[PDB]
């Protein structure tokens, strides 16, 4: 049975909140005498709606700030319901919040209970008011095989967006993500010292599935080696074919932002000599230095590994990498992708 209470606010609404978006916001306690205590509200009640706002799927931090932000002297209306069956079992288990975020900045733990991260890591956030205060989020790291590897504290979004500003992407510090299946053929970026051979090879031998996207003209005073437009890519997606892209790491990030999440394959070199041996076998004409090509891929892995979707280790002695690339691409295509909510 529902309760609908109506009262004026004085200094505070006079409530302590538990739960979160995965279970509901529950009344953890009432300050005595208060107009909210007067109108019936008590421990164990789920807050369903406040004023004109739905509280059934709001994160705990957001609910606290909303009740804080309410003007004193003015009228508050609350839909609630006694659900002691569930509030009691919000105490046995941690359960409160549950949603996923992607990090778009580097953070180093400020405590041994903290969690460090690089760009692109994903987290299940389980508590938006660690220790009943604002400042930290309790969260679980998600990496390989989508498994919960580690649990610990991180900054709340407010501090995060602020910690991230000391790096001036179009991305927010924390973005809300969720798992989806690609309803289209994902563009394919290939990095490493065999990428150019791989792009040409895939397009040449398997033109039915793959297509190279044409580069725009070269910008004056660059390196003498052009960006690709969203229109050029979209038009290739428009005919159930994988767009092969020769683009920079940042273009990949802009592509991630425009929700086109390309399959990003890094072909990891064997050695300097192994690169030459593969060069001699696959493109004996090419004038590109095996030295530079090897240093480029290490520098690129050094600074942009977060953008890698998959990795294939090159064995100079064979061209098994090709067959492995074909399979890696189709594998990635059928994978769930963490997508902006």
């Amino acid at each position: 049975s529902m309760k609908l209470v109506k009262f004026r606010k004085g200094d505070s609404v006079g409530l302590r909140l538990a739960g979160g978006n995965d279970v509901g916001i529950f009344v953890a306690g009432v300050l005595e005498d208060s107009p909210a205590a007067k109108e019936g509200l008590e421990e164990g009640d789920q807050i369903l709606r406040v004023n004109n706002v739905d509280f059934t799927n709001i994160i705990r931090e957001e609910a606290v700030l909303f009740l804080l932000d309410l003007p004193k002297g003015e009228e508050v209306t609350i839909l609630a319901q006694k659900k002691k069956d569930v509030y009691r079992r919000i105490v046995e288990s941690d359960v409160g919040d549950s949603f996923y975020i992607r990090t778009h900045f580097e953070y180093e733990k400020e405590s041994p209970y903290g969690l460090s991260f690089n760009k692109g890591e994903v987290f299940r956030v389980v508590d938006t008011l660690y220790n009943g205060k604002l400042g930290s989020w309790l969260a679980i790291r998600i990496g390989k095989n989508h498994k919960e590897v580690e649990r610990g504290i991180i900054p709340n979004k407010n501090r995060a967006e602020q910690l991230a500003s000391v790096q001036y992407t179009k991305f927010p510090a924390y973005e809300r993500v969720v798992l989806r299946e690609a309803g289209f053929l994902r563009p394919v970026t290939i990095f490493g010292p065999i990428a150019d051979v791989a792009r040409e090879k895939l397009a040449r031998e398997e033109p039915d599935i793959y297509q190279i996207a044409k580069s725009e003209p070269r910008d004056a005073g660059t390196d003498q080696r052009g960006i690709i437009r969203l229109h050029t890519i979209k038009q290739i997606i428009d005919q159930d074919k994988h767009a092969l892209l020769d683009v920079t790491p940042n273009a990949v990030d802009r592509l991630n932002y425009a929700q086109w999440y390309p399959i990003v394959v890094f072909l990891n070199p064997d050695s300097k000599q192994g690169v030459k041996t593969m060069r001699m076998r696959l493109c004996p004409e090419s004038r590109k230095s095996a030295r530079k090509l090897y240093e480029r891929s290490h520098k690129l892995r050094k600074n942009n590994h977060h953008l890698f979707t998959t990795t294939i280790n090159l064995n100079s002695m064979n061209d098994g990498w090709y067959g492995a690339l074909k399979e890696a691409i189709q594998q990635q295509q059928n994978q769930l992708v963490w997508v902006s909510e």
Partner: peptide
């Protein structure tokens, strides 16, 4: 370890 703990008084 890691109990939820009620919010402050709002």
């Amino acid at each position: 370890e890691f109990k939820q703990t009620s919010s402050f008084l709002v």
